[PDB]
Amino acid sequence: YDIPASASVNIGQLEHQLILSVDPWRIRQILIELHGMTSERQFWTVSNKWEVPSVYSGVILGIKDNLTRDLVYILMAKGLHCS
Amino acid sequence: RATRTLMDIYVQCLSALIGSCPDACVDALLDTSVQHSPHFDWVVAHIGSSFPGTIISRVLSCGLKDFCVHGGAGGGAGSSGGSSSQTPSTDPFPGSPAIPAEKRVPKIASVVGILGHLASRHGDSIRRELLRMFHDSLAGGSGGRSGDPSLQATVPFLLQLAVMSPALLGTVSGELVDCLKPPAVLSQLQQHLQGFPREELDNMLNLAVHLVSQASGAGAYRLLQFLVDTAMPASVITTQGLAVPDTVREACDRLIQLLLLHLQKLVHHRGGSPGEGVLGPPPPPRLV
C-alpha cells in the first residue's frame, strides 16, 4: 500500500519497485529519490543477481559522485541481464 | 565458627594449588571434608564452602579434581530438599557472575537443579527487562547462554513463562519482551508450540494487554519479524498458514488483532525482501 506513514517499509517498497523497474527514467527517479531521502549510502548492492564482470568493476566504482556511479552501475547491470 | 574460617581458607588454598599444579596434596583432605559434610547433613555449610571455592578459586585456571570434588559436594547438598539453601545459592551465583559462574552452577546436571537454575534465570531476565539497567545486557546474555547449554527440556520452561506473560496486564508487556529477547538470543530453541499456544484465549489476552503499553513498546514488530525470519526450521509452513488464516481470512478473535497481524506480515515480507535478495553482492548469500 502507498503512503505507509513510515520509513523502513517505505524504503523497502521503493527498492522493490526499483528492482521491478525496467524503464531507465523510473530507475533514475527512484534512485535520486532514495539518494535525497537517505544518507550517502550506496544503493547498487540491493540485488545479488546483478553480476557485473570484474573487467569493468574496477572502473565502475572509481567515481566521486555516488548518484552517477549508482545510476551507471544499475543501468549496465540491467542491460547485461536483458542481453 | 572461630576456627571454621581458617579451615575454609586452607581448603580453598589447597583446591587452588591442586587446580594450578596437578598434585595429590589435596586429594585426601577434600575427600575427608566431603565425607564429614555428608555425614553431618548440613546444606548451609556446603553452600558456604561452594561459594568460598567459587569466589576466587574459579577464575584462575581450569580444575580437574577440584571441580569434580565441588560437583560431588553440590550433588550431596542438593540430594535433600534444600529450598532456602538453593534459593540462596542461586543469588550467590548470580551475584558473582565473573567469570566461570555458568560452568560452576549448571555443573550439577540434575533435574531439580536445572529446574531451579532455569527459574532463577527467568526471574533475573524478567527483573532486568522491568528495570532496564546498564548491566542488564550481560545478565541477559549469561541467562541465554545457560539456557542454550541446558537444551535437555526447555519446552515446559518456555510454556510456563508464556502462560504467565498473558495473565496480568501491567507486567505482561515486559514479560513478553523478555521472552522475545530470550528467544532471539537462543536461536529460537522452542518454536514448534509458538503458534499453537495463542490460538483463541492467549492471543486475545496478549492483544488486550498490549494496549496498555506505549508506542516504543508496540514498535517491537521489527524485532519480532527479525526473530521469526531466522527461525522455524521445521514448523514454518504451519506457522505461515496460521498467520495467513488469522490475518487475511479475518479469523482473529479480536478486532484490532487482525490489523496487528497484517502489519507483522508486511514487516516480515519487507525484511525477507531486504535480507534475502538485498543483502550484498560480494560475500556469499545468507542462510535463512
Rounded CA separation A39/B25 (Å): 67
For B238-241, the CB contacts below 8 A with 24+ separation are B238/B195, B239/B191, B239/B194, B239/B195
Rounded CA separation B267/B121 (Å): 31
User: Does the beta carbon of B83 lie under 8 angstroms from any beta carbon of chain A?
Assistant: no
Q: Strand locations in chain B, DSSP E?
A: none
Please tell me the distance in Å from B269's CA to the nearest CA on chain A.
9
Suggest the residue from A3, A8, A9, A18 to mutate for an interface test with chain B (most B CBs closer than 10 A).
Answer: A9
Cα angle, residue B181 at apex, residues B114 and B223 outer, rounded to 5°: 155
Rounded CA separation B144/B125 (Å): 9
Residues constituting chain B: 288
Is there a contact between B77 and B50 (Cβ–Cβ < 8 Å)?
Answer: yes
Q: Write out the three cell numbers for B220.
A: 517491537
Rounded CA separation B231/B244 (Å): 17
Q: Write out the three cell numbers for B108.
A: 550439577
Give, as one character, the DSSP assignment of residue B265: H
Rounded CA separation B128/B124 (Å): 6
Query: Given A9, A46, A49, which is nearest B270 (Cβ)?
Result: A9
Rounded CA separation B27/B63 (Å): 13
Suggest the residue from B270, B276, B288 to mutate for an interface test with chain A (most A CBs closer than 10 A).
Answer: B270
Q: Do B281 and A15 touch (CB under 8 A)?
A: no
**Residues 36-55 of chain A whose Cβ lies under 8 A from any Cβ of chain B:** 45-51
Please tell me the distance in Å from A40's CA to the nearest CA on chain B.
17
Cα angle, residue B223 at apex, residues B220 and B226 outer, rounded to 5°: 150
Residue A22: its H or E element: none
A–B interface: beta-carbon pairs under 8 A: 30
HSE (CB half, 13 Å, CA atoms) of B212? 12
Is there a contact between B102 and B146 (Cβ–Cβ < 8 Å)?
Answer: yes
Suggest the residue from A20, A41, A46 to mutate for an interface test with chain B (most B CBs closer than 10 A).
Answer: A46
- Tell me the backbone φ, ψ of residue A78, rounded to 5 degrees: -65, -35
| Resolution of this structure in Å | 3.5
Rounded CA separation A71/A60 (Å): 10
Named by the residue before each, gaps in chain A exceeding 2.5 A from C to N are none
